[PDB]
Design a protein around this nucleic acid. Structure first.
Length: 1281
RNA sequence: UAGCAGCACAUAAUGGUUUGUGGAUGUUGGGUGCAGGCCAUACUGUGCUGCCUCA
């Protein structure tokens, strides 16, 4: 609160302020400059009034000038070099004054230019004095000020200083310095320090003093120790008189060690110090070796001699195992009593030296362990480059209740509220008292001091002096009842609870660690003296207007009454109530039945209904390349064959797009085209068709699984498949009745033929009969058929020819010996054969003696065309399901091909996957939901928006909607394994892997997302938005001084508007965008948090669209990696800094200010990423979209040039998440071990790549450790490549 | 172009052994991390193969 009070005080009247550190100094300076900068902008004659800075030293000039230039928008000018400045003339300073707006110069230069008068006193606006204390002394600032005050119209001077309280006899010296300073500056002074502010607002801590008396040892060993200390001093004197070199100071370590020894012995016990001394001796021996002078080395050896002498005296210690409070310093007993009194216990102890702190911690720990009563003890200590990391680790260990610390604890650490601040010794200066007492912020705050009885005499007057200084500092700073309804509704309301209610209401509002929530109240003054209070809620509140009540004299009455009437408005908003206050998880899986399209259901042909016939046109569009071909059997284009299959059905089949299949010839396109229609069949003919269909199916494919049994009727899939041939030589295909009936009467219909070949009736071979032939060997595998295609006839090869193996000379010998088979004809040819395809999943690309054989009835050309029949029929079922879904949802529709892409899960391993559509649909879903919420509920804050958005887009909600609309029932998940899972038509299981599929809810949600991606990529944005309404997700509609204050407050954003290359028709949205929560002066508009919600969703949807439309068509892993990279907040922050948005951003949080000040120089070189930068970056995008009338394309032309240099870099070298990257490289062999906690508190994880090694990684979190382990694994694997 | 049993060698794995080395509460060294050198059990892959589907 002090920062806001100082800012508004400086705004109201000329202010003098005493600071503590340079951060606040620069901060208040630049902040007031920004606040009053509106008066400087504009090269207009009636107001050409500038701002000037006066400094004493060049180094500070450079520091401040650079800080202002970097973080300010106004151009800056410097006139520091006195000789150069003085070597100038009036007409050349003229253009210098005209050029820059902010001027910085040294004291001598300032006095020179003021003396000459060029810098008009009326042209200065904010005369800021740095190190204002110099004005007290005989400094040129006095002359400068008498000059300025001589003018009629004067600037708003400000004095900034930090050297106050440095006096000796402060109770009167400070008063005189303050009075003389203020009368010179003719202004009011305000002061603000952490402790004084905390005590002013709370005044909770209580101070306590504890007296201690000296204690000696009966053994007198203490005196022995003093005499060895004196011996050490004598040795140091001997070294001093014999240093023998002015440039050598190697004795410093020696006197430092002796100083530590005497200090620790006098203050506390020596045993801890003596024990810890050995570690320093381990380095001291190295220093001894490093020592060059033999005499000095000998002295340092005597230093070791002394240390071991004390070690020798340590033998006199009695029972070192436990001290029993018999040899410790009496202060230890006092400390133990203090600790026991409260024996929570969040205690902070202060001590002088670091070594003293270490030994004190050791002593306290040992006492706690030895004393059984000491059970609450949990102590730690505060104090190469590793030590800094250790300090950070110890900061993370802040949860310890007892912390010992040295003087460094006064700053640089956000210690929580403490209930017990122990001061082990008398503080040296009032400032130390301030910093030390400024930490006991707990309610039960006890600031306890430990002091020797003798020294209390001085400490008493010191305490008096300190409290007097605090008192003068404080003094200088000082200088009907509401009811819901008449009868019922809830509890009564009292006047005193109003402040508490307002406070908790303020606490309810959203905030981040950098912001602070607090209302502002002040009294309007009245001539009658009955000033009335006015209240202002934070900018994020739903309403922004002054709340007032009747005018009363009393402050308490006015404040409570204004709070009470405020509660009326809070309830009108609805903030007050009657009291005025797993599913969707990867684990869950369900089995669902498959569904057959309605067009295919009830398709059994019958004579009393006309029937339709479709032809399965097949064309070899893309034959396999010759180089790829290794099997080398000749290609078989099915178009040459006059025969072709077709589907006979009783109900028309809707059209479906052409689709491919992959077979021997390669990629063959299918066309299920209706060629003939409106024709019945005879009864007997119908039985012929049906029996032949069963015969062909069963025997050709051999899929008569005993679990299944045939049903001529009553099965859901009852569509017939038949062959066709050109009939009557008319070039028109038809059902070849003659061919079917001839095959039906074939003698080789069942079983192998028993040929009657003999020497009198030998076998005769006819090439034409074997031109197209499938032959079944008879002799081999009786009752176990094996079919082969005829490749070609090798007339040159005969049974009498030479056999390959040396076991037999000829094939005839092989047949006569291994099987004893007679051949009637000896001089007859042989032919080559090929094995019938054992594989049946053709849905995706994976890249003999004729006498013994028997001719199969069906020709091999038709057999080859039949091998694709199951694949084609299954794909037909899939496409028909997809088309039915598309038509139902339509009732310019989306392509069923994309629908198929959206309905197939990745587990199926199908060539058509389900990721790109998923990603696009998910992004669009988020954007649509966010836009709907923004439009439907204008009066809502970020908490409500974010919670409702996450609830609406919740995966459980998506699962519920999908199941409600029946969407999950349509996907395909199982890999196509027809031998196991396929249920062919006419066959059903006779009393699950056939009629049921198990799918996870995650996959269901992914499919629903893909559907959205499909519709967005096909039917356009409007149709995609309408799709959610079709799904039921409601996202479309059902179907006094403002101008002058805005005109002033807009300041100079025009120079930014030219950078963004765009101008809004309404100026309110710029202010909406950049209005931070802390800059409460803007009472006209809302904050930026509301614009964050819309801006993020806009930029996410735009970036996802741009990545998806990339013609490279990266894999889903790359897409996910790129999405995470582009959406990363560090990236958005870097982009904001690259385009200097921070130069125009305005905020009040000093912590945020310092963080940004560091962050900006970090990027200027080219580390905490400030969240505000990303927030403003998103909010600007939201502003562009809001003014553009819901036109995304306009936002794209604005932001694409901004993003263009980054996407090129990322696409050129995509950063791949190590986790998913490893999972993709080794989806099965990579196994991650459970989380293991190491002794240092970190988590160790082991990843095992089966067959490639185990890798261990350590990290603060399980995810980080996994990432490190994956990185190590990938690095090893690539090194091994 | 099928199935299966041995052999050479690489691998990391679960156990140990031993030389060196580390900061550490180090009551006078068993708490723990990383290099070399060995012993046992066990996994995968290319070859040396061998038998055995079909001709």
């Amino acid at each position: 609160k002090y920062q806001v009070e100082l800012l508004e005080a400086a705004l109201d009247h000329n202010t003098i302020v005493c600071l503590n550190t340079g951060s606040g100094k620069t901060f208040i300076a630049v902040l007031l400059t920004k606040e009053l900068a509106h008066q400087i902008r504009g090269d207009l004659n009636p107001h050409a009034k500038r701002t000037v800075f006066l400094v004493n030293s060049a180094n500070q000039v450079a520091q401040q000038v650079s800080a202002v230039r970097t973080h300010s928008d106004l151009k800056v000018g410097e006139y520091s070099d006195l000789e150069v400045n003085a070597s100038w003339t009036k007409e050349r300073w003229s253009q210098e004054f005209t050029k820059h707006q902010v001027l910085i110069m040294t004291c001598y230069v300032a006095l020179t230019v003021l003396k000459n008068g060029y810098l008009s006193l009326s042209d200065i606006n904010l005369l800021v004095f740095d190190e204002c204390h110099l004005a007290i002394l005989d400094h040129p600032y006095r002359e400068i000020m008498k000059l300025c005050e001589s003018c009629p119209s004067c600037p708003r001077i400000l004095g900034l200083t930090a050297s106050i309280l440095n006096g000796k006899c402060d109770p009167e010296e400070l008063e005189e310095k303050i009075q003389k300073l203020e009368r010179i500056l003719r202004s009011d002074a305000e002061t603000a320090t952490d402790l004084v502010v905390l005590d002013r607002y709370t005044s909770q801590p209580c101070e306590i003093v504890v007296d201690c008396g000296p204690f000696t040892d009966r053994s007198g060993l203490y005196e022995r120790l003093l005499m060895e200390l004196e011996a050490a001093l004598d040795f140091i004197n001997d070294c001093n008189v014999a240093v023998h070199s002015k440039e050598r100071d190697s004795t410093l370590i020696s006197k430092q060690i002796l100083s530590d020894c005497r200090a620790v012995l006098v203050v506390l016990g020596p045993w801890c110090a003596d024990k810890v001394a050995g570690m320093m001796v381990r380095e001291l021996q190295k220093y001894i070796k490093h020592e060059q002078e033999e005499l000095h080395r000998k002295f340092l050896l005597f230093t070791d001699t002394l240390l071991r002498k004390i070690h020798a005296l340590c033998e006199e210690y009695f029972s070192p195992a436990s001290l029993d409070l018999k040899y410790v310093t009496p202060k230890v007993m006092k400390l133990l009593e203090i600790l026991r009194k409260y024996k929570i216990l969040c205690g902070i102890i202060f001590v002088e030296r670091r070594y003293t702190a270490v030994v004190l911690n050791r002593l306290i720990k040992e006492a706690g362990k030895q004393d059984p009563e000491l059970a609450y003890i949990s102590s730690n200590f505060i104090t190469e480059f590793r030590k800094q990391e250790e300090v950070l680790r110890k900061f993370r260990a802040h949860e310890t209740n007892l912390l010992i610390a040295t003087s460094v604890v006064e700053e640089g650490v956000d210690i929580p509220k403490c209930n017990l601040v122990v001061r082990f010794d008398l503080p040296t200066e009032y400032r130390s008292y301030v910093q030390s007492k400024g930490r006991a912020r707990a309610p039960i705050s006890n600031y306890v001091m430990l002091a020797d009885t003798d020294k209390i005499k001085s400490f008493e007057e010191d305490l008096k002096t300190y409290k007097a200084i605090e008192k003068i500092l404080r003094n200088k700073c000082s200088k009907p009842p509401y009811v819901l309804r008449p009868d019922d509704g809830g509890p009564r309301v009292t006047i005193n609870t109003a402040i508490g209610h307002i406070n908790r209401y303020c606490a309810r509002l959203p905030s981040d660690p950098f912001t602070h929530l607090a209302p502002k109240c002040r009294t309007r003054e009245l001539p009658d003296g009955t000033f009335y209070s006015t209240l202002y809620l934070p900018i994020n509140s739903p309403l922004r207007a002054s709340i007032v009540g009747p005018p009363m004299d009393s402050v308490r009455l006015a404040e409570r009454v204004v709070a009470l009437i405020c509660c009326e408005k809070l309830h009108k908003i609805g903030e007050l109530d009657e009291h005025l206050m797993r599913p969707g998880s990867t684990k869950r899986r369900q089995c669902y039945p498959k569904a057959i399209p309605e067009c295919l259901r009830e398709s059994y042909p019958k004579p009393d209904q006309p029937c339709y016939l479709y032809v399965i046109g097949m064309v070899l569009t893309t034959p396999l390349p010759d180089e790829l071909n290794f099997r080398r059997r000749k290609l078989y284009p099915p178009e040459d064959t006059t025969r072709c299959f077709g589907i006979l059905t009783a109900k028309p089949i809707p059209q479906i797009p052409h689709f491919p299949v992959y077979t021997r010839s390669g990629e063959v396109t299918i066309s299920i085209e209706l060629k003939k229609s409106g024709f019945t069949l005879s009864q007997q003919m119908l039985e012929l068709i049906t029996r032949l269909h069963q015969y062909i199916f069963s025997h050709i494919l051999r899929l008569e699984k005993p679990a299944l049994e045939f049903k001529p009727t009553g099965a859901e899939s009852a569509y017939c498949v038949l062959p066709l041939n050109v009939v009557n030589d008319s070039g028109t295909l038809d059902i070849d009745f003659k061919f079917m009936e001839d095959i039906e009467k074939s003698e080789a219909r069942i079983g192998i033929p028993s040929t009657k070949y003999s020497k009198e009736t030998p076998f005769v071979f006819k090439l034409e009969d074997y031109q197209d032939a499938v032959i079944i060997p008879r002799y081999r595998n009786f009752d176990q058929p094996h079919r082969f295609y005829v490749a070609d006839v090798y007339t040159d090869l005969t049974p009498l020819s030479k056999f390959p193996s040396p076991e037999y000379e000829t094939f005839a010998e092989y047949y006569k010996t291994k099987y004893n088979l007679d051949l009637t004809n000896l001089n007859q040819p042989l032919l080559d054969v090929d094995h019938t395809s054992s594989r049946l999943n053709l849905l995706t690309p994976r890249h003999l003696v004729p006498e013994l054989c028997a001719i199969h009835p069906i020709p091999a050309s038709l057999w080859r065309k039949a091998v694709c029949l199951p694949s084609i029929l299954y794909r037909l079922h899939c496409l028909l399901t997809a088309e039915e879904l598309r038509a139902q949802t339509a009732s310019l529709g989306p392509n069923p091909g994309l629908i198929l892409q959206a309905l197939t899960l990745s587990n199926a391993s199908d060539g058509f996957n389900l990721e790109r559509l998923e990603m696009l649909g998910d992004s669009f879903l988020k954007h649509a939901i966010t836009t709907y919420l923004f439009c439907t509920y204008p009066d809502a804050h970020e908490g409500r928006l974010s919670y409702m958005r996450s609830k609406k887009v919740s995966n459980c909600n998506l699962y519920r909607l999908g199941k409600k609309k029946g969407l999950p029932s349509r996907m395909v998940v199982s890999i196509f394994d027809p031998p196991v899972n396929w249920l062919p038509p006419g066959y059903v299981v006779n009393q699950d892997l056939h009629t049921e599929q198990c799918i996870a809810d995650k996959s269901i949600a992914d499919c629903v997302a893909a559907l959205l991606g499909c519709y967005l990529t096909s039917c356009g944005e409007r149709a995609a938005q309408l799709f959610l309404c079709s799904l039921g997700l409601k996202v479309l509609p059902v179907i006094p001084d403002a101008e002058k204050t805005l005109n002033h407050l807009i300041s100079g954003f025009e120079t930014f508007e030219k950078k963004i290359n765009y101008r809004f028709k309404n100026k309110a949205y710029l202010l909406q965008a950049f209005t931070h929560a802390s800059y409460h002066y803007n009472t006209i508009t809302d904050c930026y948090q509301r614009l964050e919600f819309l801006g993020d969703a806009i930029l996410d949807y735009l970036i996802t669209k741009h990545l998806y439309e990339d013609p490279r068509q990266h894999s889903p892993g790359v897409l996910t990696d790129l999405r995470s990279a582009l959406v990363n907040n560090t990236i958005f922050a870097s982009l904001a800094v690259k385009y200097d948005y921070h130069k125009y951003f305005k905020a009040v949080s000093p912590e945020l200010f310092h963080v940004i000040d560091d962050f900006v120089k970090f990027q200027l070189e080219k580390i905490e990423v400030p969240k505000a930068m990303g927030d403003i970056f998103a909010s600007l995008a939201g502003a562009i979209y809001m003014d553009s009338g819901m036109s995304l394309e306009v936002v794209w032309q604005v932001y694409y040039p901004m993003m263009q240099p980054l996407i090129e870099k990322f696409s050129a070298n995509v950063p791949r998440s190590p986790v998913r990257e490893l999972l993709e490289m080794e989806p099965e062999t990579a196994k991650f071990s459970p989380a293991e906690r190491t002794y240092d508190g970190k988590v160790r994880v082991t990843v095992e790549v089966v067959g490639k090694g185990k890798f261990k990684g350590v990290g603060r979190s399980y995810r980080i450790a996994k990432s490190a382990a994956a990185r190590r694994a990938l690095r090893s694997l690539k090194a091994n490549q």
